[PDB]
Amino acid sequence: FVEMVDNLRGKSGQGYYVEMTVGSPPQTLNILVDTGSSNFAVGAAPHPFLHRYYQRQLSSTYRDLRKGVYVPYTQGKWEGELGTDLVSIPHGPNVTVRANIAAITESDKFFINGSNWEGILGLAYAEIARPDDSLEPFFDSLVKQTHVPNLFSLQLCGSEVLASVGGSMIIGGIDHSLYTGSLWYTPIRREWYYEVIIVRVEINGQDLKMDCKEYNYDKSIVDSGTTNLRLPKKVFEAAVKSIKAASSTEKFPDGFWLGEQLVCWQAGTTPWNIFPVISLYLMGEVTNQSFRITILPQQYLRPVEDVATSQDDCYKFAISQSSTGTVMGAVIMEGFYVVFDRARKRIGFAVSACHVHDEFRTAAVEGPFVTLDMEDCGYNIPQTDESRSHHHH
Ligand SMILES: C[C@@]12CCCO[C@H]1[C@]1(COC(N)=N1)c1cc(-c3cccnc3F)ccc1O2
Ligand code: NI
Numbered sequence: 104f105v106e107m108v109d110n111l112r113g114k115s116g117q118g119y120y121v122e123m124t125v126g127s128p129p130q131t132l133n134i135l136v137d138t139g140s141s142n143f144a145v146g147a148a149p150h151p152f153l154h155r156y157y158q159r160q161l162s163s164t165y166r167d168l169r170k171g172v173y174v175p176y177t178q179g180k181w182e183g184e185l186g187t188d189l190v191s192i193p194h195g196p197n198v199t200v201r202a203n204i205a206a207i208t209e210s211d212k213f214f215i216n217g218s219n220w221e222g223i224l225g226l227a228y229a230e231i232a233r234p235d236d237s238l239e240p241f242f243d244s245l246v247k248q249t250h251v252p253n254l255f256s257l258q259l260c261g262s263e264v265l266a267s268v269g270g271s272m273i274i275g276g277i278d279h280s281l282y283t284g285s286l287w288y289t290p291i292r293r294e295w296y297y298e299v300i301i302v303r304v305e306i307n308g309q310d311l312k313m314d315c316k317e318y319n320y321d322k323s324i325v326d327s328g329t330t331n332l333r334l335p336k337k338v339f340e341a342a343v344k345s346i347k348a349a350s351s352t353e354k355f356p357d358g359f360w361l362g363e364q365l366v367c368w369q370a371g372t373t374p375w376n377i378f379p380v381i382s383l384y385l386m387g388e389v390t391n392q393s394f395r396i397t398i399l400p401q402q403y404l405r406p407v408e409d410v411a412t413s414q415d416d417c418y419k420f421a422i423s424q425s426s427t428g429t430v431m432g433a434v435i436m437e438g439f440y441v442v443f444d445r446a447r448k449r450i451g452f453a454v455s456a457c458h459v460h461d462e463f464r465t466a467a468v469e470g471p472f473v474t475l476d477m478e479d480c481g482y483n484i485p486q487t488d489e490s491r492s493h494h495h496h
Contacts, residue, residue, distance in 0.1 A: 104278040110194035111136065111259070111270035115405065116330050116419075117218035119259055119433075121272055124191045125204060126162025131193070135223040136257070136272055137328035138297055138443065139430070141232040142174070143190070143241040145222030147183060147206030152214040153221050157206060164189045164201075172205050174233045179212030181205075185238070195274050198249040202241045205233075217265070226255065226327075226443070230295035236495070242445075251275040253446040257327060258282075260457035261437035262413040266406060270457075282440035282453035287394040287468050289385040291448045292481060296324040299450060300386040301429060302393045302480045303472075304338065306345035307379030313338065315480035322428035322482065325441065325450055329432030331362070332381075332403060333425035342381070342422065349379040362423050365407055367415035375400055375461055381422075383431070384472060388449065391477040394470025396452050398438045401459040402466065405434075428482075438466035 112133075113119045120133040125145060132145055132155070146156040159165045168185040183206045190202045207213070207222070214221075229236040229243065246253045251274060258281045259270040271281060292298040301318040304311045320335045334342055343360055353374070358364030368374070378400030384393040404418040421434045438458045442451030458466045 104273045104276055107195055107273050108271045108278065108280070109269060110192075111272055113220075113268045114218055114265040115261070115268055115407070116265065117215050118220060119268065119270055119327060120220040121195070121224065122193050123222070123224070124193060125157055126159075126188050127164040129191065130157060130161065132157060132222055133220045135220045135328065136226065137223050137326075138226045138257070139324060139326035139328040140223065140225035141227040141229060141240045142172075142205050142223070142225045142238070143202055144174075144181060144183065144205035144207050144225070146214065148208050150210070150214055152216045152218075156221060157204070159186065159206060162188055168203075170234075172234050179210070181207050181210040181213045183207040183209070190241070192274065195272070196245075196249070196251050198245070198251060200245050200248045202244045203238055223328075227296055228294040245274075254442065254444050256281070256440060256442045256451075257436065258440045258455055258457060259327065259433055259436045260455070261402065261405075261433065261459055262408050262410050266408065277442055277451075281456055283456055284454050285468060285470075286440075286442065286451045286453040287385075287470050288388050288442075288444070288449040288451045289394070290388060291445075291450060294448070296322065296326070297443060297450060299323050299325060299431075300480050301383050302386050302474070302477070303382075303384035303395075304342070305382040305384075305395075306342055307349055309345065311338070311341050311345070313341065315478060316482050318429060319480055320428060320482050321484050323431070324428065325431045325436070325443075327433065327436060329430045330405075330434065331421045331423045331430070331432050332398075332434040333423050333430035333432065335428060336424055336426065338429070339422070339424040346379060346422075350377045352377055359420055362420050365409060365417040365419055367409065367412060367417040370414055370416055373416050373418075376463065378404065380464060383435070385452070386480065387471060389471070391475065392471040392473050394452075394468060394472065396435070396439060397467040397469070398435060399460055399464055399466055401461070402434050402438050439468065
């Protein structure tokens with residue numbers, strides 16, 4: 104899959120994007136790769152943060168679906184007009200497909216100044232698509248219209264400008280050059296988000312000793328569209344307490360632990376060893392088994408070059424509190440080659456050939472761990488009448 108290696112780019116903290124073409128003749132656009140959403144949506148009107156947008160009028164193959172879409176979320180919203188057109192990935196499979204495209208006509212706090220992307224490729228399942236699950240997501244269309252296997256994999260590699268990032272999205276397979284050691288699989292619990300189950304959390308070898316349902320309250324997901332490792336409130340508090348304790352020789356402001364303030368050391372003197380490793384044990388394919396993925400401070404402390412002190416190495420704490428469950432974001436994913444094996448309803452992890460580490464410690468994927476009479480660690484989200492009233496024909 105040499106053609107697909109190194110096809111992702113971006114700016115630190117602002118998402119990874121892949122080059123895509125839309126329409127006939129092909130219009131090139133940079134598209135955010137988001138395993139936490141399910142719409143293909145592209146800027147389709149002028150915006151201050153867009154250098155370019157999808158021009159429906161220039162495409163002979165564009166078809167209007169005569170239906171709008173409105174997508175509010177926590178920070179803001181995007182909206183626009185649904186249609187279809189021909190889509191390809193120049194540094195992807197040698198195929199062209201007709202996909203749904205949401206042409207974004209108005210948005211608030213969606214595009215990011217300087218991120219260099221103009222659209223989003225939602226790689227999650229139909230269940231969370233907008234306006235509803237009958238709007239076929241891009242990957243579903245790709246699989247149905249071509250002979251591309253139902254699997255993709257992601258290798259995310261982590262003074263005036265933000266640091267550039269790179270990576271690979273391999274569509275249709277697994278590229279063995281992108282990982283080392285064993286590839287371990289955890290079940291996709293349900294096909295909506297890429298939902299998984301965490302059965303144990305350790306911070307420098309020490310068990311947090313919480314009821315494991317707390318780790319997955321109210322879900323745990325693998326999400327390329329979130330920068331941070333996000334943890335449920337109770338888990339976040341317990342983790343921060345443990346990381347604080349391990350690093351106690353350094354007294355950081357409260358701002359740092361809230362992710363609102365950088366901490367610096369003189370260039371190349373960062374005391375990595377005072378910061379603990381974090382292990383998440385994921386449910387194995389075998390009932391009573393688990394495997395652990397272990398990340399370093401190199402993953403959870405994000406580099407940000409401060410203009411005022413460009414001679415310092417400065418870091419943001421990239422673990423944050425959630426009210427919507429665990430989010431294994433770029434912080435987690437940058438340690439690993441991550442295989443989204445939709446065909447077999449499972450997610451694979453292996454140590455990334457590009458992960459950042461030091462001479463003492465490495466990101467690791469290790470197993471099996473077996474537990475006698477393993478409890479159910481999954482949480483069942485309370486069913487609303489709204490959700491229950493939906494017919495799924
Ligand atoms: C797609 C949605 C709209 C619908 C709700 O979800 C949104 C979200 C948030 O989490 C995920 N996974 N996608 C999302 C993330 C980023 C982003 C911002 C910074 C870095 N990386 C990014 F993906 C930008 C836009 C955006 O919009
Ligand atoms: Ni009905």
